[PDB]
Amino acid sequence: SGAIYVGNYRVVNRHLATHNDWANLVWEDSSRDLLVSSTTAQGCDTIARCDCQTGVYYCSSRRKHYPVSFSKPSLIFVEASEYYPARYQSHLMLAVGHSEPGDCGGILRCQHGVVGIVSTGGNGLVGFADVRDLLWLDE
Ligand SMILES: CSc1cscc1CC(=O)N1CCC[C@H](C(N)=O)C1
Ligand SMILES: [Zn+2]
């Protein structure tokens, strides 16, 4: 679990969104596993606006932060689930690192701010849904 709180927005994995998130829906994209809902309170997370390929992510299955080198956001295959059929997920960045299903929502950050959130994983790899291209989160 986990979310990014920037201004009057809350960004979560689309497959983990609540009834409240869907009733206060701003934007969602199944191909990216992202959903953004409105909030009444203000958020203060800085979103990175960069092309960084190194950072640190939170891993709740280990209660630890891990430094990682990660790929550029791209289309990558992902297998089925009670959530999605086998398909390609866009805007996905991969790193060598530990992750389990409950790890989705953990934030990935570089020196510039929030890069994205844990969204996929398996076989010693972890995947992050990029948020750096969503320029409207700041306006
Ligand atoms: C960090 S997720 C994870 C680690 S080991 C097994 C997993 C599961 C995983 O990758 N899923 C299942 C939940 C929906 C995800 C998606 N974004 O399509 C795909
Ligand atoms: Zn950066």
Swiss-Prot record:
The active site is at H15 (for protease 2a activity), D33 (for protease 2a activity), C104 (for protease 2a activity). It catalyses: Selective cleavage of Tyr-|-Gly bond in the picornavirus polyprotein. Zn(2+) 1 binds at C50, C52, C110, H112. It comes from the Viruses. Cysteine protease that cleaves viral polyprotein and specific host proteins. It is responsible for the autocatalytic cleavage between the P1 and P2 regions, which is the first cleavage occurring in the polyprotein. Also cleaves the host translation initiation factor EIF4G1, in order to shut down the capped cellular mRNA translation. Inhibits the host nucleus-cytoplasm protein and RNA trafficking by cleaving host members of the nuclear pores. Counteracts stress granule formation probably by antagonizing its assembly or promoting its dissassembly. Homodimer. This is Protease 2A. It comes from Coxsackievirus A16 (strain G-10).
